[PDB]
A and B are shown apart, each in its own frame.
Chain A
Amino acid sequence: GIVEQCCTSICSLYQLENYCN
């Protein structure tokens, strides 16, 4: 998931906002 995939690849704001409540 994001925790793995934003650490092994670079993250993006699209992805980060998907984990906001």
Chain B
Amino acid sequence: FVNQHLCGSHLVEALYLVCGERGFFYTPK
């Protein structure tokens, strides 16, 4: 699921799955 176009909520969801308990930052520029 990581090796593809990840737009909008798709990216947030991949960050969420990848980062697990670390969490992540989502910064659209």
**Per a CB cutoff under 8 Å, which of B18, B25, B26 touches A17?**
B18
Give the size of the chain B interface in residues (CB under 8 angstroms): 21
Question: Which residues of chain B have a CB within 8 Å of any CB of chain A?
Answer: 2-8, 11, 14-15, 18-20, 22-29
**Per a CB cutoff under 8 Å, which of A1, A3, A7, A21 touches B5?**
A7
- Known contacts A3-B29, A7-B11, A16-B14; decide if A21 and B22 are in contact (CB<8 Å): yes
Give the size of the chain A interface in residues (CB under 8 angstroms): 17
Question: Which residues of chain A have a CB within 8 Å of any CB of chain B?
Answer: 1-4, 6-13, 16-17, 19-21
Q: How far is the CA of A18 from the CA of B15 in the complex (A)?
A: 10
Q: Are A19 and B24 in contact (CB under 8 A)?
A: yes
